[PDB]
């Protein structure tokens, strides 16, 4: 343990950095690195990795999903909330972000929050299915007037 | 008389809804609404 574990981390950690520096992008390297630090519960490091990966390629939707997911897995609700907001702000067209964002809020219990999100979403005049999901959302509660509106 | 947030003369510490009485140093950056409308999520 105390030192023996440590050396292991240097070899992995250093290797991860080498891979990234060599290829720069190829975000499977970024992601694997993030995952490893997440597994060791060094999530502050993980956050920085994800942010660095975003600097390289902010459009990559798998990256963002892995980032938000990581926060949620560690019960870091408010971090996740921030991240979701960013994702939808910079890549509004990606419907996956919206669906997950509303789902998370619903799970947390924040119906008002979810409603707010959906109202933002609808401003983009999206797709038939999105509207259906908003209506269905309302219909999981009575809220028939809202649905009709 | 109330002794709860629900309910100057009182001469009591009363905090009526949610003004914090103990240090938190909370991260959150104040949510804002502008004039009539919107939570300024931007």
């Amino acid at each position: 343990d105390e030192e023996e574990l440590n050396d292991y981390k240097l070899r992995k950690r250093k290797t991860f950095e080498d891979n990234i520096r060599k290829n720069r992008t190829v975000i499977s390297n970024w992601i694997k690195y993030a995952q490893w630090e997440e597994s060791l519960k060094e999530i502050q490091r993980a956050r920085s990795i994800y942010e660095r990966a975003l600097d390289v390629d902010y459009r990559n939707i798998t990256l963002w999903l892995k980032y938000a997911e990581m926060e949620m897995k560690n019960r870091q609700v408010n971090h996740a909330r921030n991240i979701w907001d960013r994702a939808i702000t910079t890549l509004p067209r990606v419907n996956q972000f919206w669906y997950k964002y509303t789902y998370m809020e619903e799970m947390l219990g924040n119906v008002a929050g979810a409603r707010q999100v959906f109202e933002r979403w609808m401003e983009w005049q999206p797709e038939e299915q999105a509207w259906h999901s908003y209506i269905n959302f309302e219909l999981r509660y009575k809220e028939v007037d809202r649905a009709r509106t | 008389i109330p002794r709860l947030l629900e309910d100057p003369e009182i001469h009591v510490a009363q905090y009526p809804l949610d003004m914090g009485r103990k240090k938190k140093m909370s991260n959150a950056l104040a949510i804002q609404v502008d004039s009539e409308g919107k939570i300024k999520y931007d």
């Binding site: 950095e17 920085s48 408010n78 971090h79 921030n82 | 140093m25 959150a28 950056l29």
Partner: peptide, 29 residues
């Protein structure tokens, strides 16, 4: 040499957003 194993190479503390990250800390291995 110590830009790795001593001190976090380059650090970006995450930006802080409408929620409380003060409380959160994480477990050892």
């Amino acid at each position: 040499g110590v830009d790795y194993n001593a001190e976090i190479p380059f650090e970006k503390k995450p930006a802080l957003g409408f929620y409380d990250t003060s409380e959160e800390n994480y477990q050892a291995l």
